[PDB]
Amino acid sequence: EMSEAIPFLPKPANIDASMPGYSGFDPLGFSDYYNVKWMQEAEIKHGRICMLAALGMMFPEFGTLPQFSSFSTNPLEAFYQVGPAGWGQILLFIGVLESFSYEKVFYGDSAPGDLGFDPLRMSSNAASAKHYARAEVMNGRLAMIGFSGMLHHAILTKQGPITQIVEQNFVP
């Protein structure tokens, strides 16, 4: 039995097709040492944060909130331009959200990523639930790569992604 992402390697033992984003990809064998469900929860959380982050590196170039209209369109400048009060409120809100994740991860036995947030019940249909389960992890990994790119490009150019693209500032 061989891995399906890397066809010349044996299939990793502790990752199965029941996991939503499975492709048989573990060449360094992380699943052989660490707790696989912990890595699933962590991958889902890193991906969700990067989905929000990849949207938010781009969105102030389209438009800003009217109270933040004087704030820079470079994300690494607008990070500082927000005062400590606004970042403290953001941190408090994230902490309130992560209290549920703390309870579920350290004291519960739910599925990885399951914080009970399905108000529209879009996982009621089984085939739709399978597609959404794979697609969340897929877009999360894509947003992880994309935000990594956007951050290091914003370090290099001191401007947002759309602005660097349309100015064609592609060389350091």
Binding site: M122, N125, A127, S128, K130, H131, A135
Partner: protein, 175 residues
């Protein structure tokens, strides 16, 4: 008959679907579900039939609320942005409700529904089967024809900067 006689017949094209002359040289039906391909073909063709009609009508008729551009392609850039967003979200609502909130290739045909049949037949029009088959053939053929026609009309309107019938008369050439 086969559209390409020097290649072998595509195995997934059995001739049941209307418009099948055996034309899949790349072999798209060998990789993807034929229902998804037919739904995409009908959607592209229907949007293009409406687009051809719009390019022909917006050349002459402009509603008094809006202020006409020089070309029906330039007509897009003179609409208020909120109106375009309203049209986009209304089309999104139609796409959500017509598919039963099953918008992906993993769940669109989970209930065994027919490709391109969204249950939109208001004015009778669907009781004779012998007329239904011929109108399936006409719909798919006019959809493909309007796809190529819409591509031509939009690219020619972008190039010349004049309308479609405005280019059919007083035709100038690239020099």
């Amino acid at each position: 008959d086969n559209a390409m006689p020097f290649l072998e017949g595509p195995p997934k094209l059995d001739g049941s679907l209307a418009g099948d002359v055996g034309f899949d040289p790349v072999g798209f039906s060998n990789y993807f579900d034929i229902r998804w391909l037919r739904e995409a073909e009908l959607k592209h063709g229907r949007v293009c039939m409406l687009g051809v009609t719009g390019l022909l009508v917006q050349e002459a008729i402009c509603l008094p609320q809006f202020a006409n551009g020089k070309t029906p392609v330039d007509d897009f850039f003179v609409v208020p942005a909120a109106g375009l967003w309203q049209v986009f979200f209304t089309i999104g609502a139609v796409e959500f409700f017509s598919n039963g909130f099953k918008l992906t290739p993993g769940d669109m045909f989970s209930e065994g529904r027919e490709a391109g049949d969204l249950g939109f037949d208001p004015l009778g029009c669907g009781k004779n089967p012998d007329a239904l088959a011929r109108r399936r053939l006409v719909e798919v053929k006019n959809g493909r024809l309007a796809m190529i026609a819409f591509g031509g009309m939009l690219h020619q309107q972008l190039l010349t900067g004049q309308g479609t019938l405005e280019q059919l008369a007083n035709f100038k050439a690239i020099n």
